[PDB]
Design a protein around this ligand. Structure first.
Ligand SMILES: Cc1cn([C@H]2C[C@H](O)[C@@H](COP(=O)(O)OP(=O)(O)O[C@@H]3C[C@@H](O)C(=O)[C@@H](C)O3)O2)c(=O)[nH]c1=O
Ligand SMILES: Nc1ncnc2c1ncn2[C@@H]1O[C@H](CSCC[C@H](N)C(=O)O)[C@@H](O)[C@H]1O
Ligand SMILES: [Zn+2]
Length: 418
């Protein structure tokens, strides 16, 4: 079973409002072999709450990280969107903060090592930390040194002893996956020198709310983060937020830079600005989260009826992509193999398997091209630009996409915009 949350991860208070509850839901990255029955498929409570002190949004429960990550199926995206963005991460970290060549970059949640490879090509030393043993072994084989463990205070000490003081510690879409964020901040403080930086990239709570990105809620994502809550945490561990860049990736994200409170790095005015913008946008008020809750109910209702109405007219519908978030979407909406006949996915591992809960088949893009699909529900919507750019033939044949946010809509639109 999953361990229930008591006190807030960031600020340590215990006062939260309920925002939305999806009940028991299977794990989003637990894909299954095709079978006759799925009676013993595990399901865990999926519900979110909002801490009134610092306004961290969090799940009510914490699924065991040993269960989630020790055999992880998701390798870092090989898309042009992520290749480009990884290059941009290097550029921002190096040029904005003046990190010299030959400097040491440690990455938490380094996965296959693609992001570290980009730092190596820019002239840096690297080391990765990732508990996914299968994925860690690939990174190591490829020449990118990765410790096959979770980040911790003692792993941080091992790194300092064996590899030294890093100029940069990086965590991309891992910080919201960790329960004991307090221990992460502590290991970071010990690791950082006076001008070292800790950088985390996470989905931005502001974008999540304004765009109704409820499908990004799943068990791996324990936290849903705004800048305010991060300041509340780092305050308590001798750390200080010095810079933030807003990013279009993964539905709107923030790349946050953190240094030692008594260190070289001055605080940029942008930090105060975003904290003021979060207040200004109603993040510290109960109404905003009840508004989010009904938006979700409306979108869920509208998405299901849109799909079932089209099917009733004799239209064929499939899913485009089989991302983790897609599985939250389809389970909450209650869609099945009768509504979507398959989900196409470029991930070889996922091909020939079946989605969690809904049990919809995952097929290859080359199979998908043989089938006369009328509509694709765009589950991998965070790659919307790249996907639409290469689906000209489908679109020219009268094919259409259904996008789930900010509001459900049909691509192509009825008119050109401009
Ligand atoms: C761009 C593209 C993706 N895909 C597939 C590959 C992937 O399985 C899926 C996209 O998954 P995506 O990268 O959005 O990630 P998700 O599977 O949604 O989530 C993973 C793990 C999660 O913990 C996290 O933090 C985020 C950042 O990453 O869609 C295609 O089939 N065709 C495409 O053209
Ligand atoms: N406590 C922890 N310490 C280090 N890595 C962790 C962790 N918990 C989860 N992870 C790893 O973090 C990754 C989350 S997915 C993000 C992968 C990569 N940074 C990318 O953006 O593509 C997984 O590889 C998972 O194994
Ligand atoms: Zn809090």
């Amino acid at each position: 079973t999953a361990r229930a949350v008591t006190t807030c991860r960031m600020c340590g208070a215990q006062d939260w409002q309920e925002v939305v509850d999806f009940g028991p839901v299977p794990l989003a990255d637990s894909f299954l072999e095709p079978a006759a029955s799925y009676d013993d498929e595990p399901r865990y409570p999926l519900a979110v709450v909002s801490c009134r002190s610092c306004r961290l949004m969090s799940l009510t429960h914490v699924v065991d990280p040993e269960v989630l990550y020790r055999t992880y199926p998701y390798t870092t995206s090989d898309s042009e969107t992520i290749k480009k963005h990884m290059g941009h991460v290097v550029a921002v970290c190096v040029e904005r903060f003046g990190i010299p060549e030959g400097s040491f970059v440690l990455e938490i949640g380094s996965n296959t090592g693609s992001q570290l490879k980009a730092f190596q090509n820019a002239g840096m030393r690297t080391l990765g930390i990732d508990p996914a043993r299968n994925i860690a072994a690939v990174a190591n084989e490829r020449g990118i040194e990765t410790l096959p463990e979770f980040f911790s205070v003692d792993t941080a000490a091992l790194v300092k002893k064996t590899h030294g003081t890093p100029q940069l510690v990086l965590g991309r879409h891992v910080f919201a996956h960790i329960d004991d964020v307090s221990a992460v901040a502590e290991g970071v403080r010990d690791l950082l020198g006076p001008d070292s930086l800790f950088a985390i990239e996470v989905p931005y709570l502001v974008d999540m709310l304004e765009r109704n990105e409820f499908d990004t809620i799943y068990h791996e994502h324990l936290s849903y983060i705004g800048v305010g809550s991060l300041v509340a945490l780092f305050r308590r561990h001798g750390l200080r937020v010095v810079d933030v860049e807003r990013l279009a990736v993964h539905g709107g994200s923030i790349l946050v830079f953190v240094g030692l409170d008594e260190g070289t790095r001055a605080t940029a005015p942008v930090v105060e600005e975003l904290i003021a913008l979060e207040k200004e946008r109603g993040l510290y008020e109960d109404a905003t989260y009840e508004r989010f809750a009904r938006h979700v109910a409306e979108i869920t209702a509208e998405l299901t009826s849109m799909v079932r109405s089209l099917r009733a007219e004799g239209k064929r519908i499939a899913g485009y992509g089989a991302p983790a978030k897609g599985n939250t979407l389809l389970n909450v909406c209650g869609l099945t193999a009768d509504d979507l006949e398959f989900c196409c996915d470029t991930t070889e591992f996922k091909q020939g398997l079946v989605l969690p809960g809904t049990h919809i088949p995952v097929r290859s893009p080359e199979y998908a091209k043989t089938q006369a699909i009328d509509y694709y529900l765009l589950l991998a919507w965070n790659y919307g630009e790249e996907i639409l750019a290469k689906e000209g033939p489908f679109l020219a044949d009268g094919g259409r996409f259904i996008l789930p946010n900010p509001r459900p809509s049909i691509v192509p639109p009825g008119e050109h915009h401009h």
